[PDB]
Paper text:
Aquaporin Z (AqpZ), a bacterial water channel, forms a tetrameric complex and, like many other membrane proteins, activity is regulated by lipids. (Calamita et al., 1995, Borgnia and Agre, 2001) The monomeric subunit adopts an aquaporin fold composed of six transmembrane helices and two-half spanning helices (TM1-TM8). Located at the narrowest point, and centrally between the extracellular vestibule and NPA (asp-pro-ala) motif, is the selectivity filter formed by sidechains of Phe43, His174, and Arg189. Here, we graft onto AqpZ the ALFA tag (AqpZ-ALFA), an alpha helical epitope, to make use of the high-affinity anti-ALFA nanobody (nB).
To facilitate structure determination and orientation of particles, we grafted the ALFA tag, a short alpha helical peptide with a minimal sequence of SRLEEELRRRLTE, onto the cytoplasmic-exposed, C-terminus of AqpZ (AqpZ-ALFA). We then prepared the AqpZ-ALFA-nB complex for cryoEM in the presence of 5-fold molar excess of cardiolipin, a lipid that has been identified to regulate water transport activity. The structure of the dimeric AqpZ-ALFA-nB complex was determined to a resolution of 1.9 Å with D4 symmetry. The dimeric assembly of the AqpZ-ALFA-nB complex is mediated through nB-nB interactions. More specifically, the surface area buried between nB-nB contacts is ∼ 259 Å2, and Gln44 within one nB forms hydrogen bonds with the backbone amide of Gly47 and carbonyl of Glu48 of the interacting nB. The ALFA-nB structure folds back onto AqpZ and is stabilized by Asn61 of the nB, forming a hydrogen bond with the backbone amide of Arg3 in the N-terminal helix of AqpZ. An additional hydrogen bond is formed from Lys79 of AqpZ with the backbone carbonyl of Leu240 in the nB. Lipid-like density is observed near the interface of protomers, located on the periplasmic-facing leaflet of the inner membrane. A CDL molecule could be modeled into parts of this density, positioning the lipid onto the lipid-facing protomer surface. Part of the CDL acyl chains nestle into a hydrophobic pocket, one of which is formed by Phe10, Phe13, and Trp14.
Residue numbers in the entry:
A (entry chain E), C (entry chain G), D (entry chain A), E (entry chain C): 1 to 244
B (entry chain F), F (entry chain D), G (entry chain H), H (entry chain B), I (entry chain L): 3 to 124
The structure:
């Protein structure tokens, strides 16, 4: 469990560092910044690389919503959930701290005024979207993310390709939802930067712990009840694929 | 135990169609709803292999070489399973068995029908 | 079949949501929008991830043109075609509806005036291209898409790599054709947004049901008649690869 | 051979259509164009998808320089070279023709004035580079491309991954060299658009038939003489990997 | 060893040529340049393609920090380290030289004034970041890079996918850190361009030989002590995965 | 050599919980700290297979079919290893053995316990 | 049935060239057009294995070790198949058989020639 | 034929170093330059397996378990091959054979040395 | 445990004779009297196989290919086992190991010697 917790902590640290640092240091650079597309690519690549690196150790969740959705899908023991979550959160926080230090090396940096890549809705949405839009988008994208994770790791899916699918799914989610809420779908990532923003981000933090997790659960349930093959169905397929 | 009674089948020229039916008895509807109902076939000198089935959740499954020509239907209330064969070929000549698959946690149990002859000769 | 229909519906929902939402919410964002390249990447990633997730269940078509072209290529039973198509369409519509709701959360949104990422030609083409250009581009790209799908899923192709090839092919198609017609090559995706546009989009909708499907058929035919190896050719290759 | 020639023709058609059409129709679109990065991605994706589709049929060259370099590397029979080249050229030309038609659907199109995505050096270089710079860049990039192709298809390389490596290598080559010469490294692609440009492109066409091919040959030679393992070396490795 | 040294030299040449040439020739092109995102993609693609090409020969390091970190992780013999490093450096230098020649073909080129894509901190940082920020970012990113390399090449990781993970990790590192120090994490790449810059780059070169290497070592140590499974743990897993 | 003494076990109805314990003797604490401590189980007519273990570094490892219901704990100072079983099933009825695995460079050495009976009958 | 008559072959020094020919009889042109025509070879003490062939659609196929030196041609109207060998090597010494492959739906049928000796000795 | 004469070896405590040498005779320098020169080793009761070699092009190759401690060198002019062993371990105790591998187109031919004993005992 | 120390061996021309000896230590005479004492040999690249032995009851046993040339003797009081080889042949060149076999009811246990080289070269 120590190995697994260390893997989850390092993975979440990598995710937060990569994505949030790309957003804070490079997204708005004059005449050469990477923009929203670059930020989405960075977020996807963090998960892809860290999955390839330590998924064989811990399973590569790096997300409390992912862990809880996998539990709801019947794929992860309940007794191990809490530990995982704690590790993830801790990792994120550490990353944020280091990021803060780095961001302080440039004149004029102000975490409170810039927002420090914090998630928000309504008046604090990047595009000025309402609370209902944020709720709908977060729910749908979390459910889709969990569905993709469940499908790609199924025993009948191509072996070894899951990290690519999951990382590119995260990139797509960011590409879709950055203008609405800043694309959290990850409570630990939201918390890590909300702590250092210190203002309105902490007031709205609860929203990004409830909506993603709920969405993840829904995703798991769907794959558990509508898409996964039952034991009898597996046996039937095996018998139907026998030469005669 | 479960008793399976089949019907239909016989002689048909190539390109024709046939309809086999099978009914189960000696089992309650609720108990049968938790089982899979399908069709096996054995051709002269070969294996007895499954060609089509309907699972306890109503999902129709087919063997690759027969999908597109066979249609398997299941009536849960009537405890009946039927197979419709269209555009028959010489390779479809065989003895067809109604089959029931039951899940016993650590293994599966098979219930077999009597068997019906289907001969496709021009 | 219920599992397969559910998989197709979810896949088409994912495709429409991802691609059209990226086009509507993020493509034109000021100073940080993702642009045409970002939209193309999103469209490709939706198909890639959904294929990896549910292709082992339903085959991962998510496109009426793909289903009909696979039928014409001798790889998909006719009796199953109609069901698939219906599922796909339904999925798309649902996605569009949700997208509409989300788009309504920002002040000044107007689906009719903006076009809601609808496909069009002539006066309604993004780049002002004529009907003939739209016809030629849609035909060629649909044929190429179906050819790629047939080749990548061939039993002699590398195993497990098909989703990557198909998704990246869709991304390339968008990169090429967005300025001409908005890159439909998918009747369900066109219908989903045309319904909510409610104006000229419905008048031109027929064009995007006929041209793609026909193109797909052509693609299938090509692979069926010029590229697929016959039974004798397979046996000859097997015999030619035997040690002596 | 008919199957192989058809595969090569279709692959080259796909390459030219995709890359040149992305350059001509979408690269310079106002406020949303894909730019040089988008064009490079399109060029890479064409090769990647077409390789996954028909490499098991023809080997997926789609480039006269690739075919000649593979011959020079001891991996392709000489008697088959000429046919391949012809097929490739034909494919490209057809693609260009269709592209021309599509480009004519927009008011103000002028192939001669715009250049029709033709390769050039000196006064006709996109960035105003001299002939020597074009020669050096084309030679180095062609040699590197052939080296990557030889290495990735080696029997000791990971199986099934070659199309990804080759396509991404083409994307990288474009990313590097577009400003210098428009990144030909492919005589057929240069010829297809030079024919329809009809002006200075035909005067400089010879340069893009000699430099790439020579570069390819060099690449092959390197892998043949410095990197490929000899028969004795293969036997030694096999014996050194035996349990005792 | 001659084969391995040649492979390392060619790989480092490819890396420097690709990345630095994309930065120098295409990053700032007017209205169509690829930007920081394009440069990061080019840097990642060089490593990805060269790994797929020659990793089965030499292991595909192309980086002195990678070699030393692999030594510190218990995966690379000490007696072979020095040779590798020399080869890498030599390769880089050659690439830089050729790049210089190419860059001289355009009027107004000035290596000293432009910086020739050299790494720097403080007054010479692209974004005006302090020395402490550069140190922290370089340390963290080097450690993460080495951790990813160790994890992806582990015997329990998916086979054949390591080049993709490593290349995309390099792309992510560039996406994060280009504005701070120009994203060295590679002493050979820094040296190759610092030599031709000839000014402040040589004064600060030491910083980019110490910080990356140290970071790499740390990464190796982590994987060696906290994440790698011991012999007893491997045996326990094998026994726990036995049917009964 | 190492001597293993087990305790606990017995009869339990389905859904109940049990706690097995095992203590080692004849070995110093430092020597035992370099070994793995775990639990094997043999069901009637089947293999004797490992279900859970704790490695020399304190990492708890489980068999897939039992993870989520079993919890293995190790006390290094007391040279003790314990197993807690919750939500027991009929398939959990078997003889459970305390096990010690020792690394000998070129091979592994096993130390076995006496065995304890666990029967889950409603 | 099909009758195959071969010709050509004999003695040749290394680096030389040879041309084998084979003609079919007892079968109509239309029937033969649906079959594959090729060449097998057996070297002293080894298998009889295929080296080259032309399928019913006119696609020439070669064994890897001989492609680049052998050229197989088929004349459908004349019911003829020919093999041209250039840059011969000592490993090319063997008995070469004209071969015809026929598809029978559920299996393949082979028609063999008499055989011709090709010896490459310096 | 080729004759191989070895030297060196003997008794060494753990952590020590040794140097084995081997010289070839009865073959011209040009002929030997086209062959590989290496070292096999057989430990008590096990296989005789290759541990290191130098190919005809001068590429040094090692077995995974010995790379980092063994260094194989080849002198083409003197027709000599030497092995340097550092940080020796008990598993290195065995009989070491000088070996020559020759390519014969369709197969490989081995030339063996007499053998030398290397014993690493503390 | 038992410790075996060998002696003798070396170089001998064909037709010569040699005498190997082996002494045991760390075991009482009574305990050793219940064990078998013999000789194994391993030739370059082959198995390590038994050639001769003396059982606990004093019965000398030989391998078929060596009987008539080898004579194995055992001194129980001195805990010694000796082998006399006469009319040596090139196939007798190998490493010879003193061996002790102990009966453990349900299995046998082997004790090995260091090994001695015997080379028969004219
Ligand atoms: C991948 C490989 C990477 C390896 C890296 C290798 C190389 C790295 C190089 C390192 C460079 C060092 C250079 C130092 C520079 C010189 C010093 C200097 O300038 O000062 C520091 C300078 C000061 O900056 P700063 O303090 O951030 O400035 C911020 C301002 O002060 C603003 O202050 P503020 O008001 O925002 O306050 C922020 C405060 C905030 O403090 C807090 O953390 C409190 C906040 C809590 C609020 C949370 C709210 C919860 C919300 C949930 C709600 C849910 C809702 C539910 C539903 C609702 C519905 C109704 O945070 C901190 O400052 C603390 C940061 C420490 C991180 C967390 C530590 C973990 C503690 C937990 C221990 C174990 C827990 C297990 C528990 C078990 C129980 C059973 O920068 C730092 O702070 C750096 C910190 C150093 C940390 C890194 C350590 C070394 C590297 C470790 C690598 C880690 C790898 C990943 C694994 C992670 C675990 C180890
Ligand atoms: C991946 C995991 C995702 C899971 C998600 C989990 C979490 C989700 C969170 C949900 C959040 C809910 C929050 C609610 C907010 C509060 C309520 C509120 O504000 O009001 C609603 C607010 C109102 O907005 P709105 O009504 O869209 O506003 C539009 C204006 O009214 C403008 O109106 P209009 O004039 O444009 O009219 C549009 C009207 C249009 O209505 C139509 O659909 C009619 C249009 C038909 C025209 C088609 C033309 C055909 C063209 C073909 C031509 C071919 C040519 C051939 C060749 C020609 C050559 C000559 O469409 C609708 O409004 C209806 C939308 C319903 C979707 C379709 C329902 C399926 C029906 C079919 C049933 C089964 C069919 C099988 C048949 C079998 C027969 C054998 O937003 C909604 O409408 C939301 C709708 C809720 C739907 C989602 C349900 C919950 C989530 C389900 C997830 C689905 C997953 C994928 C599977 C899909 C199947 C289940
Ligand atoms: C992936 C699946 C895709 C499937 C697609 C399915 C659906 C497609 C939908 C089709 C839509 C049709 C709609 C029609 C619209 C209505 C008609 C209309 O408006 O008029 C046409 C409208 C007129 O436009 P345009 O004529 O292009 O206008 C240009 C201006 O006239 C400017 O004129 P210009 O002065 O530039 O002259 C250009 C002239 C130029 O003409 C030339 O080609 C001559 C130029 C030669 C110069 C080359 C120079 C060589 C340089 C080498 C130097 C090396 C240097 C060495 C070293 C030097 C060192 C010292 O080119 C052409 O116009 C001819 C184009 C024909 C293509 C090539 C035909 C192949 C011939 C070879 C046959 C076999 C060869 C084997 C030989 C064996 C011998 C042993 O557009 C067309 O021309 C369309 C052409 C239709 C072609 C496509 C056919 C149907 C689709 C086939 C799919 C192909 C798939 C890939 C396989 C390819 C093989 C089949
Ligand atoms: C992937 C396939 C690719 C294949 C390619 C195939 C096709 C290629 C086509 C070729 C086209 C040729 C066309 C020629 C154009 C006409 C001629 C013309 O215009 O003049 C030349 C024109 C003149 O430009 P330029 O001289 O660069 O102008 C710069 C200004 O002069 C400014 O001058 P500067 O002041 O900056 O001075 C720069 C000077 C600088 O010179 C230096 O290198 C000295 C600098 C040293 C300073 C280093 C500082 C160290 C810092 C470390 C500190 C660590 C700190 C530790 C911790 C600190 C903590 C306290 O560098 C050079 O110019 C020399 C470049 C030569 C490269 C290096 C040669 C390797 C030497 C080593 C040999 C073996 C070593 C083993 C040792 C073993 C010992 C046991 O361009 C060239 O120089 C081109 C050079 C040609 C090289 C390429 C050769 C042919 C292609 C080979 C392909 C290579 C493949 C990869 C393998 C690499 C190995 C072979």
């Amino acid at each position: 469990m120590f190995r697994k917790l260390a893997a989850e902590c390092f993975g979440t640290f990598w995710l937060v560092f990569g994505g949030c640092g790309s957003a804070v240091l490079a997204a708005g650079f004059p005449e050469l910044g990477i923009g929203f597309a670059g930020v989405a690519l960075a977020f996807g690549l963090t998960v892809l690389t860290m999955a390839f690196a330590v998924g064989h150790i811990s399973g590569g969740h790096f997300n409390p919503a992912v862990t809880i959705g996998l539990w709801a899908g019947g794929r992860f023991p309940a007794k191990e959930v809490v530990g995982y979550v704690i590790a993830q959160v801790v990792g994120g926080i550490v990353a944020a701290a280091l990021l803060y230090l780095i961001a302080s090396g440039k004149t004029g940096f102000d975490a409170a005024a810039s927002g420090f890549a914090s998630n928000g809705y309504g008046e604090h949405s990047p595009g000025g979207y309402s609370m209902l839009s944020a709720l709908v988008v977060e729910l749908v994208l979390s459910a889709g993310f969990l569905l993709v994770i469940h499908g790609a790791t199924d025993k009948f899916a191509p072996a070894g390709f899951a990290p690519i699918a999951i990382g590119l799914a995260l990139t797509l989610i960011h590409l879709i939802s950055i203008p609405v809420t800043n694309t959290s779908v990850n409570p630990a990532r939201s918390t890590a930067v909300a702590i250092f923003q210190g203002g309105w981000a902490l007031e709205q933090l609860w929203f990004f712990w409830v909506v993603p997790i709920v969405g993840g659960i829904i995703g798991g349930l769907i794959y558990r009840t509508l898409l996964r093959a039952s034991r009898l169905e597996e046996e039937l397929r095996r018998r139907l694929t026998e030469p005669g | 135990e479960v008793q399976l009674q089949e019907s239909g089948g016989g002689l048909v020229q190539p390109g024709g169609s046939l309809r086999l039916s099978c009914t189960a008895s000696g089992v309650t509807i609720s108990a049968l709803n938790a089982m899979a109902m399908g069709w096996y076939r054995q051709a002269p000198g070969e294996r007895r292999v499954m060609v089509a089935a309907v699972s306890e959740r109503g999902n129709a499954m087919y063997r690759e070489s027969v999908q597109g020509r066979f249609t398997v239907t299941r009536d849960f209330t009537n405890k009946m399973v039927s197979l419709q064969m269209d555009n028959l070929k010489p390779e479809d000549t065989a003895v067809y068995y109604c089959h029931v698959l039951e899940d016993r946690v650590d293994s599966f149990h098979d219930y077999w029908g009597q068997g019906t002859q289907v001969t496709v000769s021009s």
